[PDB]
Structures are given as C-alpha cells and as structure tokens.
Write a structure and sequence with these properties.
part of a larger assembly, 2 chains, A: 35 residues, mainly alpha, 1 helix, 91% helix, rod-shaped, B: mainly alpha, 64% helix, viral protein, polymerase, methyltransferase
C-alpha cells in the first residue's frame, strides 16, 4: 500500500503534464497564427 | 462599340528608362507574407489535387 501511495502521488504529476502539453499546443498554434 | 473604337490613336513610342523603372518598382519591396494564409491556400491546393486525381483515376 505504501508503494501504491507513491504511484498515486505521481499519477497527478501526470495531470500537470497534461496541462503543460495543452499549453504547449495553444502556443504552437500561436506561432503558426503569427507567421 | 464606342470602347472598342475608342482605342484608335496609334501605339505610343517607347523609352527604355521608363519601362525598366516601373519593373524595378516591382523589385524588392518587402517580405510581408502571412504564413497562416499561405498555409491555408496550400492545404486547398492539396485537396484540389487529391480530389481531382481520385476523380479521373476512379480508384
């Protein structure tokens, strides 16, 4: 259970990754929009 | 009809300098291009080509 706890704590580091990647996509569209 | 005859006064005489000067006015004037617009029209060139080749090829 302690090790499962460690896995759970990182699984939401994934949620931040998901957000950062979404931010990167909006940015990349900005680059394409602005020449 | 009056148009098509309104052109009736002889083709004017030329001078090298003026023609060269105008086509120079078409020389470097600015690398102002809109990448989104050129990319969109690129995509449409692509879809036109693909649709056409599929049409006649019929495969």
């Amino acid at each position: 259970e302690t090790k499962v706890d460690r896995i759970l704590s990182s699984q939401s580091l994934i949620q931040t990754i998901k957000n950062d990647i979404v931010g990167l996509k909006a940015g990349m569209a900005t680059l394409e929009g602005m020449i | 009809e009056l148009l098509c005859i309104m052109r009736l006064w002889g083709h004017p005489m030329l001078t090298a300098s003026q023609a060269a000067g105008k086509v120079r006015e078409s020389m470097c004037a600015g690398k102002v291009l809109d990448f989104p617009t050129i990319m969109k029209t690129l995509a449409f060139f692509h879809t036109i080509l693909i649709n056409g080749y599929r049409r006649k090829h019929h495969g």
